[PDB]
């Protein structure tokens, strides 16, 4: 029993982490086969980040200007190109520790693990969600750019995030491993406010089911509700609409607990309207929305 925010084991990703320096900026790169992926603002000085012409800055750079280090060992760069907001550095040595891997672009509300790095060296791993406004609430310091987010199926690593930017409000923005940003953000130091965020309703419900499985049951009321009536109340508290697809995803958790999804919705309605009255659920005093139905199944019935 018990329930915690759990990341995937990072080992397979740790063996891919390298350090990339170009002139004076230093950050993290991802080494798969004979290519190193990193954020293109490795070629930016602090000055020209306010509005950079990436094409103009890159043309002045040689292969030899890219200093790529895998621990101690230097890696000779023999080619470079720019794909959207990432750089692909071809090296003459393929990473012997390359796992089986995919590149995927995830959906708002999905979760993944982050291996935060500095100077190519992993420092910690944590779990977070892609917010509905396409930010992530990470923990990042300066030089963390190039850290990646991922999921691990069985032996296969699905890379879904590379870190680029910190927004003035303290949330973070990045790309998939093809260099396309999530949401309307750019790797320019200008004004770019996040959209207003919302709560990931399907995740809150999954976390309520996890509570029941572990034995926190005090919030279960005796009522039921329609999907439309639930979505009217969820709208008012800034919750994402719940769809029949979300209801279908919650099915196994419903079967395991004996509680129909619309019944759990009625219980969550009451929590929304009345609050928690100073009680806790799975050790938390607020409604947690960064556990997907799959994270709940992985940790409870697994």
From Swiss-Prot:
Q: What ranges does the Cytoplasmic topological domain annotation cover?
A: 1-302
Quote the record's activity regulation.
Inhibited by pyridone-containing alpha-ketoamides compounds 13a and 13b. In turn, alpha-ketoamide 13b (tert-butyl (1-((S)-1-(((S)-4-(benzylamino)-3,4-dioxo-1-((S)-2-oxopyrrolidin-3-yl)butan-2-yl)amino)-3-cyclopropyl-1-oxopropan-2-yl)-2-oxo-1,2-dihydropyridin-3-yl)carbamate) inhibits SARS-CoV-2 replication in human lung cells. Inhibited ex vivo by michael acceptor inhibitor N3. Inhibited ex vivo by compound 11a and 11b.
User: Which residue ranges does the record assign to the Peptidase C30 domain?
Assistant: 1-302
Active site residues according to the UniProt entry = 41, 145
Q: Which reactions are catalysed by this chain?
A: TSAVLQ-|-SGFRK-NH2 and SGVTFQ-|-GKFKK the two peptides corresponding to the two self-cleavage sites of the SARS 3C-like proteinase are the two most reactive peptide substrates. The enzyme exhibits a strong preference for substrates containing Gln at P1 position and Leu at P2 position
Q: Outcome of mutating residue 189 to A, per the record? A: Does not affect ability to cleave and inactivate human TRMT1
**Entry's localization field:** Host cytoplasm; Host Golgi apparatus; Host nucleus
According to the record, the signal peptide region is: none
Q: Where is this cross-link: Glycyl lysine isopeptide (Lys-Gly) (interchain with G-Cter in ubiquitin)?
A: 5, 90
Q: How does it assemble?
A: 3CL-PRO exists as monomer and homodimer. Only the homodimer shows catalytic activity. Interacts with host FBXO22; this interaction promotes the proteasomal degradation of nsp5.
Described purpose of this protein according to its UniProt entry: Cleaves the C-terminus of replicase polyprotein at 11 sites. Recognizes substrates containing the core sequence [ILMVF]-Q-|-[SGACN]. Cleaves and inactivates human TRMT1, preventing tRNA guanine(26)-dimethylation of tRNAs. May cleave human NLRP1 in lung epithelial cells, thereby activating the NLRP1 inflammasome pathway. May cleave human GSDMD, triggering alternative GSDME-mediated epithelial cell death upon activation of the NLRP1 inflammasome, which may enhance the release interleukins 1B, 6, 16 and 18. Also able to bind an ADP-ribose-1''-phosphate (ADRP).
Kindly provide the name given to this protein in its UniProt entry.
3C-like proteinase nsp5
Native source organism of the sequence = Severe acute respiratory syndrome coronavirus 2 (2019-nCoV)
Per the record, the gene is rep
Q: Which residues of the full protein are shown?
A: 3264 to 3565 of 7096
């Amino acid at each position: 029993s018990g329930f915690r925010k759990m990341a995937f084991p990072s080992g397979k990703v740790e063996g891919c982490m390298v350090q990339v320096t170009c002139g004076t900026t230093t950050l993290n790169g991802l080494w798969l086969d004979d290519v190193v992926y990193c954020p293109r603002h490795v070629i930016c000085t602090s000055e020209d980040m306010l509005n950079p012409n990436y094409e103009d800055l890159l043309i002045r750079k040689s292969n030899h200007n890219f200093l790529v280090q895998a621990g101690n060992v230097q890696l000779r760069v023999i080619g470079h190109s720019m794909q959207n907001c990432v750089l692909k550095l071809k090296v003459d040595t393929a990473n012997p520790k390359t796992p089986k891997y995919k590149f995927v672009r995830i959906q708002p509300g999905q979760t993944f693990s982050v291996l935060a790095c500095y100077n190519g060296s992993p420092s910690g791993v944590y779990q977070c969600a892609m917010r509905p406004n396409f930010t992530i609430k990470g923990s990042f310091l300066n030089g963390s750019a190039g850290s990646v987010g991922f999921n691990i199926d069985y032996d296969c690593v699905s890379f879904c995030y590379m870190h680029h930017m910190e927004l003035p409000t303290g949330v973070h923005a990045g790309t998939d491993l093809e260099g396309n940003f999530y949401g309307p953000f750019v790797d320019r130091q200008t004004a770019q406010a996040a959209g207003t965020d919302t709560t990931i309703t399907v995740n809150v419900l999954a976390w309520l089911y996890a509570a029941v499985i572990n034995g926190d049951r005090w919030f279960l009321n005796r009522f039921t509700t329609t999907l439309n009536d639930f979505n009217l109340v969820a709208m008012k508290y800034n919750y994402e609409p719940l769809t029949q697809d979300h209801v279908d995803i919650l099915g196994p958790l419903s079967a395991q607990t004996g509680i129909a999804v619309l019944d759990m919705c009625a219980s969550l309605k009451e929590l929304l309207q009345n609050g928690m009255n100073g009680r806790t659920i799975l050790g938390s005093a607020l409604l947690e929305d960064e556990f997907t139905p799959f994270d709940v199944v992985r940790q409870c019935s697994g």
